[PDB]
Write an enzyme that holds these catalytic residues in place. Structure first.
Site: not given
Ligand SMILES: [Ca+2]
Ligand SMILES: [Ca+2]
Ligand SMILES: [Ca+2]
Ligand SMILES: [Ca+2]
Ligand SMILES: [Cl-]
Ligand SMILES: [Cl-]
Ligand SMILES: [Mg+2]
Ligand SMILES: [Mg+2]
Ligand SMILES: [Mg+2]
Ligand SMILES: [Mg+2]
Ligand SMILES: [Mg+2]
Ligand SMILES: [Mg+2]
Ligand SMILES: [Mg+2]
Ligand SMILES: [Mg+2]
Ligand SMILES: [Mg+2]
Ligand SMILES: [Mg+2]
Ligand SMILES: [Mg+2]
Ligand SMILES: [Mg+2]
Ligand code: NA
Ligand code: NA
Ligand code: NA
Ligand code: NA
Lengths: 465, 465, 465, 465
Positions: A70, A130-131, A221, A223, A264, A457
């Site tokens: 832990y 990013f969104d 950011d 990725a 990614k 969708h």
């Protein structure tokens, strides 16, 4: 030039070859919606590159060396040590998109207490958010602005670093907003504008000079940190002979902390990081780590398993391999070039995705019958490829009025999982589009048979018109 | 047509991309002998397909489920159960080439005690014996004859089953030798004649009819049992709509036992099998299993680890996947076709290997200066490919007289590890030969700087003439 | 004192708990022969410690990092590098008992060519030869002598190093035989005399002084090299503060080469090593490696898989962990002490095995009805323990006369797989013997219902008398 | 009775044995706070059983069989199939505590729209809410009530099912609150009252009868579903001969959905589930799955990796193994019994944890100097055990007034990771407490040297008084 793989394949996941009749039945059963197809009925799955890529032997073997304690885990330490050596950053928090939901309120309140930031005034800036990053900023009551360059979205103008900050726009917006009111700047590498576009080191330095002048936190950011380094090595002349590891260490001088999905470039199917460079951001580290426990209003627990920290500690290094990066990028470029060559037009295409204009390829289908959803279905029928519509179908309906939202372009997105498919698959995809293009007039539009209220969708079902 | 991979890559082994100058230095350091190169300095390693191939996710995961018990292991049972279901064979002995060294003396003595076989007279027959099988027969005092067909070695005559038994030759040799004196027949599938050539089911049935008439044991030599089934499915019209599993079950009716290295079609880096069909060969099973313990003159122990039996129990099934087999064979055909197209001639090429005629490609180099060793070195220099010479260098010196043995053809062998390299590597190899062919006049012959007494090809060092 | 495990358990293999009635039926079905029981019906399997032990997380993870290249593998190099750092030995040959079948003829011929060794005269010496080592010596026409000490087999005399060479006996035998005629000496550590007994460093030095004086090769037989080092650390005062790695490096100065099964102290289920210290044994390395290829009379191929070399490269280090060794040895001592305490007598017991005297525990059963086989069956019935008889049943029949061979002691062997069972299992085993001892008068002898000609102990079936 | 392990150990994680002086230095360096110790310096880590347990060979091997597809993964399907067969539940959502944060608002709004639930009135009921479940209820504006039985917290009254619902209290509270206002009932198995106590099937049926009468959703909180089944099998006479799988299928008839952390009985270090029984809860499944995507105010993505779904699909079965459950529970009972026997008193002890009363063991230390933190430190010094204080140190300060909160009992919690440590470790822990108890008078209290504002127990540093 598709490059040869700088690797031997060692472990494969078999995928059956289906008949056209089988796929015809399959796509009907899934309501003309590839999201509802079984993975096993998809030959080439281009739905997403997030967590779908292959990994190296050393990365997979690291999953067997986990210390599941832990606190005080050697697996956590190995992961922090990789961050320290690769990025120069002293403080690491493993995340199970690197806890945007954590740094954002932490940085807002910091500037609130320290500089009298005013929540009703605040604006955060990015070369391109990013969104989800934009999402957590807005949920927190923060307006965002993307300060991207003139050339970013311009196809047919070629430019080496289309993900760059508009440095003058950024200075102007901080001044217009008031620097007390700007809780952070996010530098996204590579940038999500225009299909994925790199950011130069000269640009990040200039950006970070602006942010330091105003004492505004900069969050990288990250990725796609390695593909961004590769583009700098390939196109920014100053860095031509530097290694990917050297460019990355230099790059990260020009932020105060980083947030990344590891799914990614770091080549793992699970995990992220939220990291802080040095003791000047110690109190932001403390506050983030604290909020990580009590984000819900009270303590919750858990975190990455030990073997997954071990695997990511290796994957941060393996994702920087220069031959690998050269190969990965060349393959993505090969697909886009091959589509162009057969007259398929993309509205945008870059490192992250190619966005095929289904409107133009299928001009007889009205936007409200979802020509990019039709084209997704047809690619499935013809070649067993799965791709995601980014058009009227995804856009969906106005929740105040129940009418279809208006949508500027009916696109089909192709993403490419890393180290998963070969030049022969890329040629297979190009051939499929060549077939579609030739049969275009005969492809039908779609209409609902079942439509959820929200997120339609993912689970709507349609039939042909 | 190179087919697209019927699989997703999931685990890769990175291989660095070297410069030409680095490879030049490397090949000197290894004494112009690719056997002495480090694996990591080889980009495309075509030395052998034996145990160098990739495996499926289920096969790799089975390594984690081993029961390591000395006797009664469930891993042994799972492996016997796979043999029983795939081949119909009731008795399995796992081996760490499936213990040719065991069945051979066992079958010799059987016929000795039962039928008055006479060791001074004995002859064993095959459509084509592998070198080691021929080796253990001769060590045991048994002459061998290959009864292969007229068309076997004839390139430019195309024939669907060039690995077939010469059924009339086989009948004639048994009659000429005396059937009491013929301790076994080995049916090799696919056959090692002419680069690797398949054997029809009609042929095996006819062969097994001959052997049953004389009550001669038939051993199926089965390292490539699945590729052989695929060729039957593709070319033997009767079996066109049968599955690989159905052809394999039917195939194995036409032998009494099987021996195989699992390191080719069964997709593992370790193991083999020696198996017996039914109780009629119970006493041969008993005797083999007994000799397995006391082969040395006294008991020795050990055997495959449990996870390796588990892995092979899956690999026997995964190696039969039809899409996989179609893809594997098409890739090997693609390389040979691409070499032909650029004017590279092979003396023989089939399922197992392509044998490039280095004599013809490099005509200015005398055979005693090893033109195929020169060509191996040059392919390494140009493209980082490693391939093995099968010519005067391997042939070596007469051990009675110390002179170079005379050798009919100076060949360079290309083998292709399964599910390891892609069409882009195959194009890379073809391109390398195109370069070599064009630069041929400039390539130098070799002469020894260090020469061992025996097995010189593995560790000799040479320099350019 | 059973020590607590210096480890966390991370991966377990479930074993079902059977009822007494189930085990009664099981032992009948297996013909009163535990060798014929399914592993899954055995609760505590004490058949052998060879390759049945647990391994560490790093060792298991190394199986995923294999370089499967035929030559020049980095996995081979990592394994040679571990040998070089741990033993100081420059030359490594991985084996799939470390190729006794290879070094023996190599060392015989060496002395033949160099010193006029005479095959009709030759004798090899050991502190105690393992059975198979003795086997390959004799097959090669070499007599062996064990020169063990007076105290070796004497229980009730306690002595710290009962595996020591009788240094005076060794000198006398070399002189009596003629040093030209002594092709090697094998130093076995720990020694297989008396249940497994350690060898002091002072003793090995003195032995190696004798061998160097006569220029006789010394081969360290090293399956238990780490337990031997631990005993030196614990009992040889000079080495009390040295690490296991330091004692091992010092130990190996006193041999010229080593042979070992890796399936005991090196904690793997597959593999062995044959290694040579320095260039003075280069020609013996060359000759061994050469014979490894052509041992059969012609070339054969194969060898450990890459992940298995990687795993052994780690296992050589992990098997030296001091806490682990202290724990392993203490557990074996705990079982023997607990058996003594309840009045079970062992004829010999040491590091390798405890040999329970079934004759004495079951005095009413004649030796020809196999009282140790009866006791094996009864331990199975009572507690689900499987153990191997070393008595008249194993000894078997005279192959010239068909009568039962005469056998001095009817023993039941208990071996303990490493890091596999706990103190609670040891208490379970002691409790089972306590039950047996108390019910002894009622246990029946056995007689054959099915008896093979050779190796009867593996597959014979018996019934109660 | 500590039972013997119904398993063979196959993979171990080495843990070094430290000296007392080393541990003394270590505990100082970590500020007398075991949370700040390195895992590698802890011999027996009893901090938590959540995700720290061992797993079976089949579970670990399943990590290598992942289908990483974003939708339609066969790994997701295998996991849903395990839920369907084990629990009878048709709808599965994998979670990365099974998304309490998702079902709670979903069930609140459901009753709001359907029955006019009034958020200002609402109350949820449990036999005993876990802290985090209570947390998410309250964050959502829901009061909770634990309706536990009289006997629950009464030690020295022994009762077979101390986790039972107070069925009359539950009926009374629904009536008092108004059933329109009761958005769910959580049935926690085993219950977290009193150290962990089981819940009878008769009790769950009666509870579910009450909930169905009022049409109130019942959620089974299922982290310990298998231990609960084992207790029913052992103590509820009706179920004595039923299998764990049968009791579990029957158990789950008495809820409408389940939520569980998989990190306890399902034997994995990562994951959870939120599942719905049948189509009557389809709309709650839909709504949960939808909120899972948009929980943040907008879409976010990710989810368990494929190999982790595969591993959990096996772990749900392996965690039900009867021998394993009998062994696990017996070990926890063995530790508590051994502590009682040496005069160590627990304020509560059950399946989940034993809470040692450090106040009573160390009576000379005032509560404000943290006698249970002192005792944690002393256990570390003496034996290298790490355990967590549940007393004034954890309780912390009033955030309105900055004074130490008042705390009723100063406890030290012992939890036991599954299948990780042995009886010898349990005896080691008991021995350590025996030493502490005997040295009690000399152990010092603690005072801060560094104190964070919030969550001080994780990173505060203290010194001795
Ligand atoms: Ca690592
Ligand atoms: Ca298997
Ligand atoms: Ca290694
Ligand atoms: Ca599974
Ligand atoms: Cl590793
Ligand atoms: Cl598996
Ligand atoms: Mg602050
Ligand atoms: Mg964890
Ligand atoms: Mg992509
Ligand atoms: Mg016979
Ligand atoms: Mg074994
Ligand atoms: Mg080949
Ligand atoms: Mg010699
Ligand atoms: Mg190999
Ligand atoms: Mg033993
Ligand atoms: Mg609703
Ligand atoms: Mg995923
Ligand atoms: Mg616990
Ligand atoms: Na570098
Ligand atoms: Na089939
Ligand atoms: Na050391
Ligand atoms: Na069952």
């Amino acid at each position: 030039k598709h490059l040869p793989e700088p690797f031997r394949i060692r472990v494969i996941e078999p995928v059956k070859r289906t008949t056209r009749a089988y796929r015809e039945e399959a796509i009907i059963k899934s309501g003309m919606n590839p999201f509802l197809l079984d993975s096993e009925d998809v030959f080439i799955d281009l739905l997403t590159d997030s967590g779908t890529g292959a990994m190296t032997q050393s990365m997979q073997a690291a999953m067997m060396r986990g210390d599941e304690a832990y606190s005080g885990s050697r697996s956590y330490y190995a992961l922090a040590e990789s961050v320290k050596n690769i990025f120069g950053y002293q403080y690491t928090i493993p995340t199970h998109r690197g806890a945007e939901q954590i740094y954002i309120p932490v940085l807002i309140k910091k500037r609130e207490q320290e500089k009298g930031l005013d929540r009703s005034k605040m604006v955060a800036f990015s070369n391109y958010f990013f969104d989800t990053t934009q999402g957590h900023s807005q949920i927190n009551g923060c307006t965002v602005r993307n300060v991207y360059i003139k050339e970013a979205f311009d196809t047919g103008v070629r430019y080496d670093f289309k993900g760059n900050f508009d440095l003058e726009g950024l200075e102007r917006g901080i001044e217009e907003v008031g620097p007390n009111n700007v809780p952070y700047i996010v530098a996204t590498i590579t940038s999500n504008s225009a299909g994925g576009q790199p950011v130069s080191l000269a640009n990040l330095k200039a950006m970070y000079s602006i942010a330091k002048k105003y004492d505004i936190p900069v969050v990288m950011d990250s990725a796609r940190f390695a593909e961004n380094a590769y583009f700098i090595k390939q196109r920014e002349a100053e860095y031509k002979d530097w290694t990917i590891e050297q460019i990355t260490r230099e790059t990260y001088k020009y932020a105060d902390m980083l947030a990344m999905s590891a799914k990614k470039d770091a080549m793992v199917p699970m995990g992220g990081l939220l990291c802080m460079k040095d003791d000047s951001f110690f109190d932001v580290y403390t506050e983030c780590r604290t909020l990580c426990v009590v984000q819900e209003g009270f303590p919750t627990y858990g975190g990455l398993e030990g073997g997954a920290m071990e695997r990511l500690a290796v994957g941060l290094y393996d994702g920087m391999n220069l031959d690998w990066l050269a190969y990965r990028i060349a393959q993505v470029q090969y697909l886009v070039d091959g589509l162009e060559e057969i007259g398929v037009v993309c509205q945008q295409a870059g490192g992250h995705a190619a966005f095929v204009d289904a409107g133009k390829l299928l001009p007889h289908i009205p936007a409200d019958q979802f020509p990019a959803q039709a084209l997704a279905c047809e690619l499935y029928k013809v070649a067993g490829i799965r791709a995601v519509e980014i058009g009227s179908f995804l856009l969906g309906r106005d929740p105040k009025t129940g009418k279809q939202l208006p949508c500027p372009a009916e696109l089909l997105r192709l993403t490419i999982p890393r180290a998963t498919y070969t030049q022969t698959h890329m040629d297979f995809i190009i051939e499929a589009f060549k077939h579609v293009k030739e049969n275009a007039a005969n492809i039908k539009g779609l209409t609902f048979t079942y439509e959820p209220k929200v997120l339609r969708h993912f689970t709507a079902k349609l039939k042909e018109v």
